[PDB]
Amino acid sequence: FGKRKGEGFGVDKREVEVLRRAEKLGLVTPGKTPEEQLKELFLQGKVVLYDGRTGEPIEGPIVVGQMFIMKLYHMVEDKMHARSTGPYSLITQQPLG
């Protein structure tokens, strides 16, 4: 928010609306300035986010952050198996690949 203040702009209609719904929720002490309010809400670990599809905010602060997440090993179990027709067992006559 500090660079936001210097870069030249303040709070959105969006940013204020979510704040209303937010104080009505119990996340921000009613009576404080949105600047001070957003801080209190950020400290909560939650910030204001716009839908991206509609550009309208998502009523209610939502947490966001840097979560370390790993990709898991794709076995030959992943690479899906779909079988039409094919091999068959020598003694039992059931399908096998």
Binding site: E7, F9, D12, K13, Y50, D51, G55
Partner: protein, 229 residues
């Protein structure tokens, strides 16, 4: 005009370089800053056309997972760095431009080392392509194209030279878009919107140029409501 029409969105602009560009527009009726700002944002990221490294060919390298002697970085790390190269051509006649570069020995290969091309410009000079030790022989030909969106190297599969390796296409000249709608005062009624959207660009195109293209794609789509059926 004087009354309702002179009272028109004051389009103000503040742009430094070709990367950042703030755009203020006020006054607006009720909840319009949001009605305009989001669509323009959704366009500004998905729709704007640009440039990206389409294919590469190292002279002695055959596959993407190889390593070149006298070169720290691996083919993969290098083709990766290439996707970071931002080029900017000046006219339609340049659909596919092949940049050529060859450097040897104890030198660091930066993007300014590419032999200049008449109608193409490289605003990503100091980008680090590789570190050459000794007897470091690196001669490559990196293709460049103009497109839109994201194209997996798998989707296009470019083959200038039979042993060249295709690279992932990154065509959005914009990294991020931001808009704010702050209340503005018009003598009579205090409930008003003011939309200021800040756009960032890799340099290929400018914030203003992007914004304009954006508004056009939206207008072009608004006309598609013409013939009922």
């Amino acid at each position: 005009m004087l009354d309702s029409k002179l009272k028109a969105p004051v389009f103000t602009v503040r742009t430094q370089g070709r990367e950042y560009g703030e755009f203020v527009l006020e006054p607006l009726e009720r909840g319009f800053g949001v009605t305009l700002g989001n669509p323009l944002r959704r366009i500004l990221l998905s729709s704007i056309p640009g440039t990206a490294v389409t294919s590469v060919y190292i002279e002695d390298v055959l596959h993407e997972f190889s390593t070149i002697p006298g070169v720290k970085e691996d083919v993969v790390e290098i083709i990766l760095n290439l996707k970071e190269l931002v080029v900017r051509f000046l006219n339609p006649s340049l659909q596919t431009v092949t940049l050529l570069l060859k450097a040897e020995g104890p030198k660091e290969v930066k993007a300014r080392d590419f032999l200049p091309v008449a109608d193409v410009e490289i605003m990503n000079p100091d980008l680090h392509i590789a570190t050459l030790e000794e007897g470091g022989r690196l001669n490559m030909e990196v293709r460049v194209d103009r497109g839109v969106g994201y194209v997996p190297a798998e989707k296009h599969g470019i083959k200038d030279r039979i042993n060249a390796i295709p690279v992932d296409a990154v065509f959005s000249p914009v990294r991020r878009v931001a808009f704010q709608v702050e209340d503005t005062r018009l003598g009579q009624r205090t409930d008003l919107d003011k939309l200021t959207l800040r756009i960032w660009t890799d340099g290929s195109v400018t914030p203003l140029e992007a914004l304009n293209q954006a508004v056009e794609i939206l207008r072009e789509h608004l006309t598609y409501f013409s013939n009922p059926q």
